[PDB]
Write a protein that binds this ligand. Structure first.
Ligand code: FMN
Ligand code: FMN
Ligand code: CA
Ligand code: CA
Ligand code: CL
Ligand code: CL
Ligand code: CL
Ligand code: CL
Ligand code: CL
Ligand code: CL
Lengths: 341, 337
């Protein structure tokens, strides 16, 4: 059984260094009955690989960690190929920058144009769809799956007051900083941010990442606390606080929409509960609020704190002792408004 | 001078192709226009270059040509022509089997087909920007006056509790498909789906289009509920719609780890709140006074009082529910028992 892979990447690199890739590739691909082509053009690599499923996969894992390229995207995988596309070529390297033949110029220009455009579109794609494509899965074909998820929601305290008083550029700087911190920490704990909705960050963890979701939440709150006293009191970042809600439930995860517009969405009750628990933190002495189901997913010896039943009928709300606000929330929102007067 | 590159989907023969090339060569010679037309696996690629007012004069006619569909202009740029000798060189890349070109041909095909998939996930604003020759990654966020639209599915948690997953997915896809088609038909821009919610925007000149979008959606769902049998889950599909108006910052937001087109501002939150509020109203549509002020048509506006500082909520008479929402939510659950 044989498969064929095509990927693109960003060149990180001397002309003689690329020759060394060709040299080694030809040797290894001959031994392993792998065939294919490597092209390069205006700082991008294009490679097609084909051969026995297992030898191709071992090579691709190796290519994934090669530091001579970054931002690798496997565009297409074919699983039960009958013929090789390049049966004579262990690894043929083609420098398309070198080809100035007039009849190849249109195709060369179009490949560069469409691939650069493709690379821009990738930046707006959701991580989960990027993952599916990388795994050889048709996002337009795969069925959504019911999965057990911890939903994470966070947003900026008194964000309407920030947007009312601050210039547009300052708001953007602040929001970008907030999104950067949240995204880096969520991703470091193995979570996936799903969307930004206004100033809100929506993310998800698996049922085995209960403690990681609490740690992520506590780490975000901690980094904002550091940031607020790192900056001068006139920097808008001095005013940046967050609240976080977590929920746990069955959600349907997948690609939804029509041929006119697709998106990657999570469907289910847990989404709205986590959002509502996020909003509830504004009137709690804790910056983090979550459901009994989230507590059930935790293994670590947190000092859980029962905050009673709250209408979202009414459910129990929990937090942990580390999430206690060192401040009174209403005074902070008034202080935020006075600072920008 | 100007140079355009676009792609397009061929809409369902050699001598018809030849007519495009023959007639293009004549006009492009007349207009001093040069370029190349490539086709491959049902896709057109074309590059056009020439004096500014000459090429876009021809691109407007290419746009409304019936022989291709889903036209995306990928690039707009000029000192020197790229194809000075070709009024229009047509290249059928399907019927070239030369061995050294099949690598480039296969990459062109795979990346373009992949590009067409990614296009479907983009914010409408980004697709609009690319089409207008502007790279969306380098636009700085701008404060714009927008009408924000939120719609979601009534009693959706009951539907998700009772229906098989695949039936939920068919139902949500139908809903999204209806909302997206109509929003886009009225010139609105869908920005994202969030759970079962559709988020979209309209400009301040589109107050009446925003209300008409909302009523068309409600009206199509009402048609659909009696088109299908009472055992089809689409028999149970209702929406509520919230609209707000305000200053919002639109643009790229995030970091290298995750970036996205976002809308920031109170109007976003207000529209979602008013969408949720329709549950407790005799009307499936609620909007602010600012949306009302954006409307030129003689709607029968109905003032529904202030709601939590409080804000005034309006609707139109045509948005009145013929049902009572509590009974309907109970009916949905009972039906699914
Ligand atoms: C763009 C690119 C393409 C590559 N293609 C191949 C290839 O086709 N076959 C191969 O053996 N190595 C390829 N390599 C390099 C391998 O990842 C790796 O550096 C080396 O070949 C294996 O080292 P090893 O002999 O210790 O296993 C490629 C590297 C880059 C950057
Ligand atoms: C893919 C495609 C590419 C085309 N390219 C050109 C072109 O480059 N120049 C041109 O005059 N017409 C081109 N046409 C055809 C125009 O849409 C239209 O048929 C033509 O301009 C008719 O000219 P007329 O105003 O004399 O009727 C193209 C059509 C298609 C479907
Ligand atoms: Ca906020
Ligand atoms: Ca809903
Ligand atoms: Cl930081
Ligand atoms: Cl701990
Ligand atoms: Cl604790
Ligand atoms: Cl947004
Ligand atoms: Cl009217
Ligand atoms: Cl009316």
């Amino acid at each position: 059984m044989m498969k064929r892979l095509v990927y693109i990447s960003k060149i990180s690199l001397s002309l003689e260094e690329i020759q060394r890739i060709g040299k080694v590739s030809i040797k290894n691909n001959q031994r392993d009955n792998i065939t294919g082509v490597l092209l390069y053009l205006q700082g991008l690599f294009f490679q097609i690989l084909e051969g026995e499923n297992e030898k191709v996969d071992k090579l691709y894992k190796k290519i994934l960690v090669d530091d001579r390229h970054t931002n690798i995207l496997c565009l297409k995988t074919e699983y039960d190929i009958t013929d090789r596309m390049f049966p004579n070529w262990a690894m043929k390297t083609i420098n398309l920058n070198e080809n100035s033949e007039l009849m190849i110029q249109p195709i060369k220009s179009l490949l560069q144009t469409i691939t650069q455009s493709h690379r821009v579109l990738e930046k707006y794609m959701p991580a989960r769809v990027i993952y599916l494509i990388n795994q050889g899965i048709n996002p337009l074909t795969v069925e959504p799956q019911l999965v057990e998820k911890i939903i994470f929601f966070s947003d900026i305290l008194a964000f309407s007051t920030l947007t009312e008083k601050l210039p547009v550029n300052e708001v953007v700087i602040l929001v970008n900083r907030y999104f950067s911190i949240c995204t880096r920490i969520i991703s470091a704990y193995g979570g996936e941010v799903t969307k930004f909705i206004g100033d809100c960050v929506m993310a998800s963890f698996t049922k085995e990442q209960g403690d990681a979701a609490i740690r992520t939440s506590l780490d975000i709150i901690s980094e904002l606390k550091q940031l607020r006293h790192h900056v001068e009191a006139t920097n808008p970042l001095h005013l940046l606080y967050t609240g976080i809600g977590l929920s746990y439930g069955h959600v349907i995860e997948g690609n939804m929409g029509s041929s006119l517009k697709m998106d990657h969405t999570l469907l289910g009750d847990a989404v709205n509960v986590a959002a509502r628990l996020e909003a509830l933190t504004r009137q709690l002495p804790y910056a983090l609020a979550f459901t009994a189901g989230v507590k059930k997913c935790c293994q670590a010896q947190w000092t859980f704190i029962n905050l009673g039943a709250h209408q979202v009928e009414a459910i129990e709300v929990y937090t942990v002792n580390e999430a206690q606000k060192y401040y009174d929330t209403l005074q902070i929102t008034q202080l935020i408004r006075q600072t920008l007067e």
